[PDB]
Design an enzyme around this catalytic site. Structure first.
Site, PDB file in Angstrom:
ATOM      1  N   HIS A  39       0.845  -1.228   0.000  1.00  0.00           N
ATOM      2  CA  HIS A  39       0.000   0.000   0.000  1.00  0.00           C
ATOM      3  C   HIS A  39       0.872   1.268   0.000  1.00  0.00           C
ATOM      4  O   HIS A  39       0.296   2.371  -0.070  1.00  0.00           O
ATOM      5  CB  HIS A  39      -1.045  -0.047   1.131  1.00  0.00           C
ATOM      6  CG  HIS A  39      -0.584   0.358   2.495  1.00  0.00           C
ATOM      7  ND1 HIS A  39      -0.510  -0.543   3.545  1.00  0.00           N
ATOM      8  CD2 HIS A  39      -0.252   1.563   3.012  1.00  0.00           C
ATOM      9  CE1 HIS A  39      -0.116   0.085   4.637  1.00  0.00           C
ATOM     10  NE2 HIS A  39       0.051   1.378   4.337  1.00  0.00           N
ATOM     11  N   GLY A 141       2.708   6.285   9.485  1.00  0.00           N
ATOM     12  CA  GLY A 141       4.147   6.118   9.207  1.00  0.00           C
ATOM     13  C   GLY A 141       4.734   4.886   9.880  1.00  0.00           C
ATOM     14  O   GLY A 141       5.825   4.469   9.449  1.00  0.00           O
ATOM     15  N   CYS A 143       3.675   1.879   9.701  1.00  0.00           N
ATOM     16  CA  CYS A 143       3.526   0.756   8.736  1.00  0.00           C
ATOM     17  C   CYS A 143       4.909   0.258   8.297  1.00  0.00           C
ATOM     18  O   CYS A 143       5.819   1.093   8.116  1.00  0.00           O
ATOM     19  CB  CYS A 143       2.693   1.171   7.533  1.00  0.00           C
ATOM     20  SG  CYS A 143       0.921   1.202   7.908  1.00  0.00           S
TER      21      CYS A 143
END
Ligand SMILES: *[C@H](O)[C@H](C[C@@H]1CCNC1=O)NC(=O)[C@H](CC(C)C)NC(=O)OCc1ccccc1
Ligand SMILES: *[C@H](O)[C@H](C[C@@H]1CCNC1=O)NC(=O)[C@H](CC(C)C)NC(=O)OCc1ccccc1
Lengths: 300, 300
Positions: A39, A141, A143
């Site tokens: 993503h 952030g 992730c």
């Protein structure tokens, strides 16, 4: 008795910053491969209903900005394995520890190295809930932040963070990109199952409590595996099998308390509650220590 | 909202094994100096009533076995600074991070890298209690394990572990060897003062709770600084000054809740209790998050 995380050193030297368009998040740099959530390729709009193949096809190697501290890394290859992107780079990570990828079971624990812009900010110990969520601390952030266990010199990577849910709990994948639970990397309302308490973990922690001189919750009573499970299922406790009992054997033999006597102690806490008392300084029943975590902390 | 420790990487590469006679414990290898507890020189018998000067005089450099992983280090100098031994070695630590030594105040927090035989086993976040103890996880051999905060690239070492007390709580020194609290490195019954709750930390955590959508404990009432402190002192809470209020300012302005309105919320929890409810999944009031820890976790 503290919730201890593994030392993060070996994992710290694998965390890289990954940018694709506007979107920036964390990647894991092992050998000549960077792993991150797929993503990273999505704009805020794409995240609503993304066709990842179609979105990925519009991207070339040079669209992927992978930075390690102050050094830039050139991408020579990219592929999608389930929900993770694999960026092949020119430079093998010099700080690559001995590692493997493992898919953990519900109720198992791991350390999370929470990162922002490829930079580690902090470490904590959590459990994979029976409903394949984690109750964690993840800002935007975060992730690409990874979960791991350390056996000797070998880092076993089990989790990569993808998303927070309306509940405020967190969902993510193994390092092959398979989601834990029924979750998809899509911005839609997604229901986690009803969560249950990890019964074998709670018992392990009652053994930890005994070992550390807190014995008040111990009673004269005993119980049966069936009679207990009918109390467990009432209080949304994961049912106890003979495997769970065999895993508790070391702690049963160490403290001289039969598993079923401990089970009976638990019933009376579930039925009567805590009464304003505490166990290892906790007013609730702790289920984020595995029997293995308890023995490793009690023997060092 | 998780109790996060600092990444341990920079500290891991400073931990060495130190042996003197039978006794083995952990040392901190920075530049050409190893720091460890001076009681490394004690036999089980000496620990009852030791004359450290006299015991140290019977020891020469070659009596001190300092190992880093698989490499042996030759000692060329030894001195006692208060309760720590400073072993000067031939080889400056190549992995020495930017560091300083700081003496923290009661109520401040730090990460502990729990070690056994110079080898890191796990990391956790704790608070220096108002009575200068810590509630920690330390088995025998854990001595020389260090507490630290990380600002940018700079490790601030604040604590080295020396001893457990009858209470089961832990006492130790700064890196200059001055004990936190009235404690001595001697095996005698030693009383910690009555411990108090770190009021400014609890308020910080109620702000953390608001920020994370848990607002139920908020009430219509307000209070005064004096009227509150007379409730605090009743419930063994550290009294709240105007400095404490100014430190909470960022969190007060972020959530739009005046400190004294939060204070009034706290009174009603102290007076009425929790009522079976939880705050950020905790049935007790948490005091091991500083206002700085809350803002750093909430902004990442
Ligand atoms: C990745 O950096 C990010 C982590 C989120 C941000 C807030 N807390 C987290 O754990 N994940 C996402 O942006 C993710 C993207 C989907 C394509 C999977 N969506 C997500 O986390 O759900 C939406 C959301 C955003 C902000 C707060 C809470 C939920
Ligand atoms: C140093 O390795 C050791 C750490 C202790 C061992 C149990 N838990 C700890 O934190 N400290 C000592 O051996 C120390 C020596 C004195 C000279 C300071 N004594 C101590 O910790 O108190 C006695 C004690 C021993 C074992 C369990 C509980 C207390």
């Amino acid at each position: 008795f503290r919730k201890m995380a593994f030392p993060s050193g070996k994992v710290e030297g694998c965390m890289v910053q990954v940018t694709c368009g506007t979107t920036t998040l964390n990647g894991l740099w092992l050998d000549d491969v960077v792993y991150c959530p797929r993503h990273v390729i999505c704009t805020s709009e794409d995240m609503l209903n993304p066709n990842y193949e179609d979105l990925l096809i519009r991207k070339s190697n040079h669209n992927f900005l992978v930075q390690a501290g102050n050094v830039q890394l050139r991408v020579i290859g990219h592929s999608m394995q389930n929900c993770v992107l694999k960026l092949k780079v020119d430079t093998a990570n010099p700080k690559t520890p001995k590692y493997k990828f493992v898919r953990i079971q519900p109720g198992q624990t791991f350390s999370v190295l929470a990162c922002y812009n490829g930079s580690p900010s902090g470490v904590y110990q959590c459990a994979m809930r029976p409903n394949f969520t984690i109750k964690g601390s993840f800002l935007n952030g975060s992730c690409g932040s990874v979960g791991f266990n350390i056996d000797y010199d070998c880092v076993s990577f089990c989790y990569m963070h993808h998303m927070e849910l309306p509940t405020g709990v967190h969902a993510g994948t193994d390092l092959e990109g398979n989601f834990y639970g029924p979750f998809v990397d899509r911005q839609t309302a997604q229901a986690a199952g009803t969560d249950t308490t990890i019964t074998v973990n709670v018992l392990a922690w009652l053994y930890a409590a005994v070992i550390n001189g807190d014995r008040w919750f111990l009673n004269r009573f005993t119980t049966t595996l069936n009679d207990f499970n009918l109390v467990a299922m009432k209080y949304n406790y994961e049912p106890l099998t003979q495997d769970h009992v065999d895993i508790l054997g070391p702690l049963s033999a160490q403290t001289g308390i039969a598993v079923l006597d401990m089970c009976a102690s638990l019933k009376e806490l579930l039925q009567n509650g805590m009464n304003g008392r505490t166990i290892l300084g906790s007013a609730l029943l702790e289920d984020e220590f595995t029997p293995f975590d308890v023995v490793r902390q009690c023997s060092g």
